[PDB]
Write a protein that binds this DNA or RNA. Structure first.
Length: 341
RNA sequence: UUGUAAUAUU
């Protein structure tokens, strides 16, 4: 199958092998496991002139190498360290294949690499081909990364269609394993008038989103990085739901995050809520102190409360210390209290 | 010795 030259190379019959010596075998070498690594390493220390000799052969069947397990690496090397003309010639080779490459395990890596190192006008050409196929890519294990790289590297103006695709889909994709990460890149990069519709749908579903295994991360992203107004809407939804949401595997992390990033006044109001709520027989606090998730929340409130409110809370916990030692998760409240005592 | 993130390529 291979060439004597490639078989001989695989069987270490060439310790002094140079790129010059494999002219005419570049394609075949690029598709070989060792051949590819050989080319990748020699190219790192090749003069611009030597790199061009290689490029001449990789150009014609560029597509064939882009979708190849090993050949994709040789292509990306050229986006990383190539002349402008080489990078344009490769972007010209990608033209009309963006989507099919994006949805492919190796091809997608070439695309991501290209977005990072081609000129803005060329990025804009490349991304146009994703228009109509956003959801397909976002849901895709490989494609979703191409989309994230678009958001990171491309002028936000060129991506209105991403936003437009997400309209009515925010909830669906904030609860999707790959869509949630895409939402998190949008909140980070896309313009205010572009996040605006995204934030609107998030606020409409926050109670539900905090209880999702992925959604909860979206809501916490806003609590950590968003505008004060956004943070406020979120804490307000959480507030009045602290007791139940504190006992929920997923949303319990969101109540902690609200406790950390809420205004001093908001934080105090949330801590006050659990202090004054009475879940039947005993306090909502008591319920939380023996719960598997909420014990964390209570400890969090202890660490972030202003000293005066922390004291009140501690003193309110005191009456139940003897009981708390019997329940599995109680030890953890007591550990925390002991730090402060 | 208490609780959640994407099996993304040589």
């Amino acid at each position: 199958g291979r060439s004597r030259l490639l078989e001989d190379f695989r069987n270490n019959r060439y310790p002094n092998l140079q790129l010059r010596e494999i002219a005419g075998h570049i394609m075949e070498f690029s598709q070989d496991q060792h051949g590819s690594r050989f080319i990748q390493l020699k190219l790192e220390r090749a003069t611009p002139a030597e790199r061009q000799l290689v490029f001449n052969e990789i150009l014609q069947a560029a597509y064939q190498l882009m979708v190849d397990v090993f050949g994709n690496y040789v292509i990306q090397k050229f986006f990383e360290f190539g002349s402008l003309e080489q990078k344009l010639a490769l972007a010209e080779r990608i033209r009309g294949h963006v989507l099919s490459l994006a949805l492919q395990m190796y091809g997608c890596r070439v695309i991501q690499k290209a977005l990072e190192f081609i000129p803005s006008d060329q990025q804009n050409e490349m991304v146009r081909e994703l228009d109509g196929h956003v959801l397909k890519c976002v849901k895709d294990q490989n494609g979703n990364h191409v989309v994230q790289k678009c958001i990171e590297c491309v002028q936000p103006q060129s991506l209105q269609f991403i936003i437009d695709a997400f309209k009515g889909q925010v909830f669906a994709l904030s609860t999707h394993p790959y869509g949630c990460r895409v939402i998190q890149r949008i909140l980070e990069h896309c313009l205010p008038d572009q996040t605006l519709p995204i934030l609107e749908e998030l606020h409409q579903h926050t109670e539900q989103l905090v209880q999702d295994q992925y959604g909860n991360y979206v809501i916490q992203h806003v609590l950590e990085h968003g505008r004060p107004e956004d943070k406020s809407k979120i804490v307000a939804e959480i507030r009045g739901n602290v007791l139940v949401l504190s006992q929920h595997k997923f949303a319990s992390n969101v109540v902690e995050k609200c406790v950390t990033h809420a205004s001093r006044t908001e934080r105090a109001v949330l801590i006050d809520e659990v202090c004054t709520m009475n879940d039947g027989p005993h306090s909502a606090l008591y319920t939380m102190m023996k719960d598997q998730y909420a014990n964390y929340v209570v400890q969090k409130m202890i660490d972030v409360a202003e000293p005066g409110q922390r004291k009140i809370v501690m003193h309110k916990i005191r009456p139940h210390i003897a009981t708390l030692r019997k329940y599995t998760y109680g030890k953890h409240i007591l550990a925390k209290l002991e730090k402060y005592y």
